[PDB]
Amino acid sequence: STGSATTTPIDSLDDAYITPVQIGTPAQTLNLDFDTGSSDLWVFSSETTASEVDGQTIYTPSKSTTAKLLSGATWSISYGDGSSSSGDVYTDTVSVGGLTVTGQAVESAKKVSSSFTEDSTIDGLLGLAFSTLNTVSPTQQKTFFDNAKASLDSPVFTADLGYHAPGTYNFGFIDTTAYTGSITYTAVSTKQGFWEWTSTGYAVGSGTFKSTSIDGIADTGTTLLYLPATVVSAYWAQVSGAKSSSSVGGYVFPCSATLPSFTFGVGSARIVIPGDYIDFGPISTGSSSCFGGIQSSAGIGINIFGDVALKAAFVVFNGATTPTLGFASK
Structure with a gap:
């Protein structure tokens, strides 16, 4: 069925x-x-x-x-x-x-x-x-x-x-018509009960790709992309006027900004999140401060590939005897 x-x-x-x-x-x-x-x-x-x-x-x-x-x-x-x-x-x-x-x-x-x-x-x-x-x-x-x-x-x-x-x-x-190119599969750990996997790195905008292992979960029920503070700081440093606001609860940026893309690695493959996907709009109605879609996972205890990341891809949750995750561009 x-x-x-x-x-x-x-x-x-x-x-x-x-x-x-x-x-x-x-x-x-x-x-x-x-x-x-x-x-x-x-x-x-x-x-x-x-x-x-x-x-x-x-x-x-x-x-x-x-x-x-x-x-x-x-x-x-x-x-x-x-x-x-x-x-x-x-x-x-x-x-x-x-x-x-x-x-x-x-x-x-x-x-x-x-x-x-x-x-x-x-x-x-x-x-x-x-x-x-x-x-x-x-x-x-x-x-x-x-x-x-x-x-x-x-x-x-x-x-x-x-x-x-x-x-x-x-x-x-x-559905082989729903994505472009090929699906890259990657290993899953089920030890914490999640679809937990390890990204191979990231890039900010047109910047060079940083090869680094980032363990996290594929989580459709979380809105944003939560990553280590180092990664998140590197992203927001490319947005003039962006800052982490303790009062708001994360990174905010001027709504007049044009946001850079963010790329994450899946094995040797790359998924590109367009900058517009990272804009979560005014912090309160009428504000010119906008809430960022990439936020620090520090204090969550786990990195979370939420909707911001997943919506840039076609994602396969493979529930075979040994589960795996697949990502394709689309």
């Missing part, structure tokens, strides 16, 4: 992407944030504290003839950005882009943190990291991909995120 679904930016900055997902019988369609950096499929629901729901579409398990309470199971998650959610668990039928999994763990939120409430466009998350990170207790549950994998034509999914435009998540096949 295969599946193919369009993923759409939630706003004009590409702060996140939402993908429609069918849950239950009859289908209840919720727009979920596909997150290769976590491993829980959780939704706003009829069980979510009413004051914490503000415009989201909710899953109502009592209206699904295929929903079953997973007795005794609870979940609780905290994300790197400080947001969190928790609740109980149902199993139900879940379909993405025509690909159906029966008995998928659908984690129903009883509580969500303010950042979730405040984002009306995101009805939940669909985790696509390794199932070892799934938070369900006392019986850990599998991701949608893990459940689908054996049925797929090939045990892969691909992320093709758009810049200020929709893109595509495919399951079970590689």
Whole structure:
């Protein structure tokens, strides 16, 4: 089998992407944030504290003839950005882009943190990291991909995120029309539960390529590109007036600037992030200070190839017995 679904930016900055997902019988369609950096499929629901729901579409398990309470199971998650959610668990039928999994763990939120409430466009998350990170207790549950994998034509999914435009998540096949040149594959460590890999270096604008190993994760659920402070300083040094602002929480730059591109290495291959992808707009409405899309990972504890990086590529998440990651230009 295969599946193919369009993923759409939630706003004009590409702060996140939402993908429609069918849950239950009859289908209840919720727009979920596909997150290769976590491993829980959780939704706003009829069980979510009413004051914490503000415009989201909710899953109502009592209206699904295929929903079953997973007795005794609870979940609780905290994300790197400080947001969190928790609740109980149902199993139900879940379909993405025509690909159906029966008995998928659908984690129903009883509580969500303010950042979730405040984002009306995101009805939940669909985790696509390794199932070892799934938070369900006392019986850990599998991701949608893990459940689908054996049925797929090939045990892969691909992320093709758009810049200020929709893109595509495919399951079970590689669309050879969706990228240019060849796909370069690179090794993955699953030891921390992430799609963790090592970039071979970087360049800033038309500058020379610096060969250096940068371990990090391919994370569709993180907006920005978080890299070591040395790398980030070298980038922003090429933007007149750019500075790290402790009060704002990262590098800012004059909105009148033209940003240079940023290149990262995948083996001997190179992915170029155009400068415009690195602009996250005014820090507050009407400001002439703009927020940068490349930020330091210092104090996160890990480098993160988030959407800023991934949207410059066609990315293969290869879930073969030994997983790997593939990147192509597009």
